[PDB]
């Protein structure tokens, strides 16, 4: 069955290489943007492993007299949730900032978690990381476009992936979504203003394993 | 003879795992028949499945010898909503250590398959009772409650007649094997906990001894497999 | 040619990094964080994958000592620039060819190895007033220098994991869950030592490096590659 | 064994391109099936043909971020007898660099075949128009005039409905390949220029946004071929 | 793999122990007990089995010089920790692969051997004012260093006994019947010597070790393995 949530408004203040991202299944875990999964989401904790695909939709309001462009693409094995603070994002940070813009820290991945040296070792000069983002290369991924001249919604499906045939329900975070502004928003004044966004999801062929009680507490 | 050939960067060197042999010494060698001897043994897995004794602590035993890490447990008069015995699913614990499987694995890298878990009791035969058993896969908390155990991989053993019972682990692993060494209680090796609860309290006629004893075993199952033997440590020489 | 054949493409050797020559049983560096006074033998336990690494242990970010002075001990890392700049894909698996490269001319040495995630313990024993580090023999092979020698060898895939993720987004542990750290994605560690007793420990200083080659690999799915600053 | 043989002046030496292998380590090796994973990828040419984004400058963009070398261009209200955009036929330019083909070639010596050139527009759909396109082979002057472009290898794209269009270079070369590296704008590699002219000016109804945007792509064609991969540079680590 | 195949399992080499380099015909150590003044050449007659041993003769218990000083001469022993910790069986038989390991760099040496229970006698003769220990030639093979060299070889089962008891409970002799001592369960003894006359005896001191490998073995019946102290 389908599941759906909401996302902020595409605003004129947003620019090219401005975006936001969503993790799978972390969206359900956080009920991100009002998202709710319910029965299977609770089942997650009672089953120590799982394996499934996905099937999604996204929507946003446009009008003929708008110009600008947006992009949607799934990307796996990313650490986009990690902030420069070194942790995944709570419900407040993205709900507040509402649109990320590219910077060297994410063009390099330097924000990834790191270790405390202790007094034993010299402090390094952080300069590089492998989880960078090169936006010019993202067209390789199959993707879909939402633009005033094109559409107001999109649909995509993806398979399961992972270094093992199945993975822990709690830790498996192979797939991540990102949505980015291809061209800044604009329209002759008075038209549909700063449309909001929504997203829908379905898993495909999900199979729970490792049956046990709900998540022996932390 | 003299002809262009291929050298190597490390010709004639010695590595501990050299695969081939060298010049022999002599011919005319003769050896006697071993036929009169019983049963040449070929593989570890042949013997690893024989039930071995576990080494559970003796509940603050006050003897000057102190602990008695021993395969048996005594029967309590009282019970609580927490197992008689619990332990992580980890090969490094002493009850694992001195088993056949534990001794083997102590010189291996990774493990695969499942193990046989055998159970035993030692009290007077005029006793009737039952016990609950629950394997707890990895979770966010070590099981305590009987109801929790019921949610876990669980079964109940009838002590009504048989004072012994057997069990085999299920092999669930995202990897082909699992790290044998207890480097850390991590997703690579650690696989939750076990639990043990007494289903109902004592039932005995007169003159029967009180608070009897309970015994347990362990040994490999048919599916168990290990990988990459590893070197030993001689500190026990001390 | 059909150079674009990836399997053929990467099957060539390249440097990993240097390490210091050993002269006794060594204290493996402690897990982080590490504090002054916890003396340990850094710079000999040669990790075996070009991933970002630090002090014989993996690493996620890349930081380096751009400055020549400061407080504390200088760690060491390892990156395969060629392959990592050419690695526009997601998952990986292959075998690994490697060969010894001594830095000191005229060297006599012995080397050893243990696999991925294989814990280390040597200690030593006195052979007639002469300590013999246990590692002189043990579970794993060894090779020796012909007063210098190009020792070569290969190792297979070993991890319980089905494949090697080129870049990663999971979490390492149930606690202190380090993102971007797939632990079981290497081949272990080696160590080069003089064939002399601990008593024969010398004042001279020696170093050795190594070259590594990919063998019969397999690759999956796309992945990005670094951008270049336009200046 | 001991027999006359053939030595070499450099036996056992190491060259980066050694063609053969050496002694193995161990037997008994087992590996898991990768069958559950999707689509092992074998060759670069498989992916190189996916349209990639170009990096055209943002016409003196005044943002403190300064330049935005970006695949798109904006629609001008005026036009001149000189292309909207022109550039030499050279693999080293930034618009080439960060493409799939550019990233590949950055570690190759020479190139052969042809590439796909894809075009795009971003304005309101109520727009009607046309554009002229002209590839300029090497000559004594970089094309400016529309008439000059008409003499050059040229075509016209209808923006009437389709806001995207494709093109493929023709492979003309006195040599089998051409030097990939921009050592100099020389007969070995450089192959002229491209030009872009708008055929007719704007046509829009009321309420439609003004001066819309134009987008473009690039990716390899079927005939493209490279030679002799080359080593990289890590300075981007900075 | 099928590592659990015992025959495959143990077919790898490991150190036995060190011995001193010889420079003349030697006095074999006398049978115990031995008294001061009965000067004898200890530490060159290399026994050839990892059983507990003492002064080129077998041993039953294990005792070692945990203290650095005392009265008398320090003996030497030999234990194969890996195999003896893995030896959970009763009877045994196999062949034996072995290779030389010189401790002194840049050494020139010659080595010899004689089988299990083979008594020793060399003496020496003067070749033109130069003594020639008879052992320079004799019943058994010899091998030499290429200014250093990895001399290797193998030997078969030799004892009149049908098999080798892993651990033993019989009695050695009709008199002084030492329990736990199966005498005829080894391969003999070797000896490394300089290819120089006795007159060329030098002040310098040299040492050599050896590695040993099991070949095509056979095993019978279970047996226990050591317990570990829980502390
Ligand atoms: Ca040759
Ligand atoms: Ca020859």
Swiss-Prot record, chains B, D:
Subunit and partners: Interacts with host entry receptor ANTRX1.
Organism of origin: Seneca Valley virus (isolate -/United States/SSV-001/2002) (SVV)
Cell compartments where the protein resides: Virion; Host cytoplasm
Known function: Forms an icosahedral capsid of pseudo T=3 symmetry with capsid proteins VP2 and VP3. Together they form an icosahedral capsid composed of 60 copies of each VP1, VP2, and VP3, with a diameter of approximately 270 Angstroms. VP4 lies on the inner surface of the protein shell formed by VP1, VP2 and VP3. All the three latter proteins contain a beta-sheet structure called beta-barrel jelly roll. VP1 is situated at the 12 fivefold axes, whereas VP2 and VP3 are located at the quasi-sixfold axes. Vp3 also seems to be involved in the binding to host receptor ANTXR1 for attachment and uncoating (entry).
Protein name as annotated: Capsid protein VP3
Coiled-coil spans in chain: none
């Amino acid at each position: 069955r389908w599941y759906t949530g909401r996302l902020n408004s595409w605003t004129k203040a947003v620019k090219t290489f401005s975006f936001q991202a969503v993790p799978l299944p972390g969206a359900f875990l956080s009920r991100q943007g009002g998202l709710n999964g319910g029965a299977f989401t609770a089942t997650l904790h009672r089953h120590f492993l799982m394996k499934c695909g996905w099937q999604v939709q996204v929507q946003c309001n446009l009008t003929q007299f708008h110009q600008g462009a947006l992009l949607v693409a799934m990307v796996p094995e990313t650490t986009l949730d990690v902030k420069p603070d070194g942790k995944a994002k709570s419900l407040q940070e993205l709900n507040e900032e509402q649109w990320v813009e590219m910077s060297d820290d994410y063009r390099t991945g330097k924000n990834m978690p790191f270790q405390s040296l202790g007094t034993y070792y010299r402090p390094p000069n952080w300069t590089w990381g492998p989880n960078f983002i090169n936006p010019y290369q993202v067209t390789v991924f199959p993707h879909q476009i939402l633009n005033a001249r094109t559409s107001t919604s999109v649909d995509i499906n993806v398979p399961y992936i992972g270094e093992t045939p199945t993975q822990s329900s709690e830790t498996q975070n192979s797939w991540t979504l990102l949505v980015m502004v291809l061209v800044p928003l604009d329209y002759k004044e008075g038209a549909t203003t700063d449309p909001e966004i929504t997203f829908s999801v379905r898993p495909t062929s999900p199979y729970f394993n490792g049956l046990r009680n709900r998540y022996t507490a932390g | 003879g003299p002809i262009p050939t291929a050298p190597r960067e490390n010709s004639l060197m010695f590595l501990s795992t050299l695969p081939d042999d060298t010049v022999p010494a002599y011919g005319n060698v003769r050896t006697p028949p071993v036929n009169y001897l019983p049963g040449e043994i070929t593989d570890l897995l042949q013997l690893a499945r024989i039930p071995t004794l576990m080494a559970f602590e003796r509940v603050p035993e006050p003897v000057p010898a102190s602990d008695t890490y021993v395969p048996y447990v005594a029967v309590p008069t009282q019970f609580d909503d927490r197992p008689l015995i619990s332990f992580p699913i980890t090969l490094s614990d002493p009850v694992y250590q001195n088993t056949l499987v534990g001794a083997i694995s102590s010189n291996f890298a990774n493990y695969r398959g499942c193990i046989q878990i055998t159970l035993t009791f030692c009290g007077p035969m005029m006793a009737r009772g039952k016990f609950l058993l629950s394997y707890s896969p990895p979770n966010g908390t070590q099981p305590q409650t009987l109801s929790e155990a019921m949610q876990c991989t669980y079964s109940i053993w009838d002590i009504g007649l048989n004072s012994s019972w057997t069990f085999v682990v299920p092999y669930i692993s995202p990897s082909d094997y699992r790290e044998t060494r207890a480097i850390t209680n991590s997703v690579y090796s650690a696989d939750g906990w076990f639990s043990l609860h007494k289903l109902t309290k004592i039932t005995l006629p007169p003159d029967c001894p009180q608070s009897p004893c309970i015994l347990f075993f362990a040994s490999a199952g048919e599916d168990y497999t290990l990988r990459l033997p590893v070197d030993c440590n001689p500190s026990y020489v001390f | 040619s059909n150079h674009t054949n990836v399997k053929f493409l990467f099957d060539r050797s390249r440097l990993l990094n240097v390490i210091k020559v050993l002269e006794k049983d060594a204290v493996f560096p402690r897990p982080f964080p590490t504090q002054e006074g916890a003396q340990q033998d850094d710079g000999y336990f040669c990790l075996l994958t070009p991933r970002p690494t630090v002090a014989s242990r993996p690493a996620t970010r890349f930081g380096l000592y751009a400055n020549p002075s400061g407080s504390g001990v200088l760690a060491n890392t390892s990156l395969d620039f060629n392959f990592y700049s050419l690695a526009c894909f997601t998952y990986f698996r292959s075998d690994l060819e490697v060969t010894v490269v001594s830095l000191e001319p005229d060297l006599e040495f012995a080397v050893g190895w243990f696999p991925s995630g294989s814990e280390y313990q040597a200690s030593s024993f006195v052979y007639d007033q002469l300590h013999v580090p246990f590692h002189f023999t043990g579970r794993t092979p060894r090779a020796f220098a012909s007063k210098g020698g190009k020792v070569s060898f290969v190792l297979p895939w070993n991890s319980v994991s089905s494949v090697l993720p080129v870049r990663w987004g999971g979490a390492s542990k149930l606690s202190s869950a380090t993102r971007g750290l797939p632990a079981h994605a290497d081949w272990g560690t080696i160590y080069a030592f003089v064939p002399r007793p601990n008593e024969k420990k010398s004042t001279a200083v020696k170093h050795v490096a190594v070259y590594i080659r990919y063998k019969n690999a397999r690759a999956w799915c796309p992945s990005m590659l670094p951008f270049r600053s336009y200046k």
